[PDB]
Amino acid sequence: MEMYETLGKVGEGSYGTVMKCKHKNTGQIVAIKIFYNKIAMREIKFLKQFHHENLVNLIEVFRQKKKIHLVFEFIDHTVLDELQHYCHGLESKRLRKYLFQILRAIDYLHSNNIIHRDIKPENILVSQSGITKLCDFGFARTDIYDDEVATRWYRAPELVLKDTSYGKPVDIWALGCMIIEMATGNPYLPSSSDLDLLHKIVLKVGNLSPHLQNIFSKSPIFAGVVLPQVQHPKNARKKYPKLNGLLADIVHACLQIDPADRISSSDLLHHEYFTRDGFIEKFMPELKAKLLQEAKV
Amino acid sequence: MEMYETLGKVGEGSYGTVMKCKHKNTGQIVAIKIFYNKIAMREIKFLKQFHHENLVNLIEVFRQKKKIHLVFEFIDHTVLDELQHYCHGLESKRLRKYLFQILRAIDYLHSNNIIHRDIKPENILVSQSGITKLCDFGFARTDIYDDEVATRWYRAPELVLKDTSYGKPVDIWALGCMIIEMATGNPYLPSSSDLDLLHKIVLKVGNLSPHLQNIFSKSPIFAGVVLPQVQHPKNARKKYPKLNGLLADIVHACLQIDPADRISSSDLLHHEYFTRDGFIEKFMPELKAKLLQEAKV
Ligand SMILES: N#CCc1ccc(Nc2nccc(Nc3cc(C4CCCC4)n[nH]3)n2)cc1
Ligand SMILES: N#CCc1ccc(Nc2nccc(Nc3cc(C4CCCC4)n[nH]3)n2)cc1
Ligand code: NA
Ligand code: NA
Ligand SMILES: [Zn+2]
Ligand SMILES: [Zn+2]
Ligand SMILES: [Zn+2]
Ligand SMILES: [Zn+2]
């Protein structure tokens, strides 16, 4: 006997579905993920051990009609919603606040040696008061194939080339891509296939590092294929000239072809972008007080 | 006994594969489309009746290893190749020459009441001398579902909403999108789902026309969903301000939400964009003489 009034469908994928619902007794508004199973179980495994105030809350798990249901707290919208509803990207003060909270989340995970593996705008939830939370841990790890169209756009060059090892740096690449999109409103590496993606990476970001060039030139998927050979500015302000200067600096530090050249999440949190005008010192009390003032009501 | 030396793979889709090959006796370089069948047969049906100098030549058809093989002439590259290899889009003089020839092709088809149904950069072939040819007629008609990722980006709002009738105007919408991409280097409506696409159409182009709004608000796929409500400049130069003025004017005329408001292919060929400086009068002899000088050798 369904304990939930399904209210509407807010998502769907190769995996299944997210439904906005209302517990029949609680009256509580939830988001229920419903699959058709490794991925369900490893998401559950993760949410049992890991907790943070910029990660989404899991409430319960049931298995009605031979399917697994994951009830989460409901958060007003996503960053994808913002980019789909408003022109030209996020206002700059608001962008900074989102990014810091996104970074707090990613750093928490990276300190615990978790790779998220699916950073993108839909998986950033945004409450009405503007507290952001990270979600979707089905592919998180200490490779499971992610068949999703949007996911390709944020994939790092080592994932695209199927390098046998990869790690935390793939979350940093995806973040750098998302930052550009949140700043301009436009996805940076939109692509319709991996071959397309590889060309765009090389065209817009940089040539393959030697190891990745080696894997490319030995890969049978990509035989005959010669990549674009392109010069790029070495200066961040030049290379992303439509962005705020320090924002350009971060993006440059994220989008390095060689994963080992990418900035860590720790260092990103301490970047001049966030410390310039005492923002962290002003923001953290305002954050702690929201979560206070909201927790009471 | 394969009569062809397969040389390399230049394409692949939900349909099958394109291989660059060399006939073992002729030594002739070909592109062979290989399926796994309605779509094969309707492409063949089309290529038997229809012929033009800006459409790709079919040579023969065979059925080896329970599969259908369509041997075409081989053309150096595609417009997709150009956008994947070079920064910031096509040089303006070259863009104009491509578009005119693309339009000659589309108009030829529309005069014969054919809807192409899959205008996009990969399906524009470009020879070394820069003669362009249209290809891929599997979905051409006087709706078969097109499962391809890139295809979504060029789909008109009526296709997205599954309107029971649509026609020639969907080729004009797709062309307008492709023009923007060829001009800037960036796809205009990159999207990862139809819901995403609908938001971007409304955000960047215009609100749904009343009939399409009706279908949207009655559609079960899209229930609960409220689209972005957005004002757009009415002037073409303003609305696409990074384009050449007359090029902006064409794009505006293509990208009208109501298909019945879109410009015809006939009128596009006669636009000021092509007549301003006597270009058609200068271009057509240069075209006819290339095809002469090339036909001899
Ligand atoms: N997982 C996942 C991916 C996903 C994430 C968001 C959405 N769409 C969406 N769209 C609007 C609001 C919203 N609020 C929300 C969702 C959740 C859950 C975490 C996650 C599954 C419920 N909590 N609060 N989600 C759709 C898919
Ligand atoms: N059909 C179709 C779609 C398609 C079109 C082009 C390509 N890729 C490509 N990439 C580089 C060159 C090229 N030259 C070429 C292809 C053809 C055929 C018409 C069409 C099928 C062979 N003639 N000349 N095609 C891949 C797929
Ligand atoms: Na995911
Ligand atoms: Na096609
Ligand atoms: Zn929306
Ligand atoms: Zn390796
Ligand atoms: Zn290429
Ligand atoms: Zn209708």
Numbering used by the authors:
A (entry chain A), B (entry chain A): 1 to 36, 44 to 149, 155 to 309
What did the publication describing this PDB structure actually write?
Here, we present the crystal structures of human CDKL1, CDKL2, CDKL3, and CDKL5, revealing their evolutionary divergence from CDK and mitogen-activated protein kinases (MAPKs), including an unusual αJ helix important for CDKL2 and CDKL3 activity. CDKL family proteins contain a conserved N-terminal kinase domain and variable C termini. The kinase domains of CDKL1, CDKL2, CDKL3, and CDKL5 were crystallized using a phosphomimetic Asp-X-Glu (DXE) substitution and in the presence of identified inhibitors. The CDKL structures all contain broad spectrum ATP-competitive inhibitors that bind to the kinase hinge region via 3 hydrogen bonds.
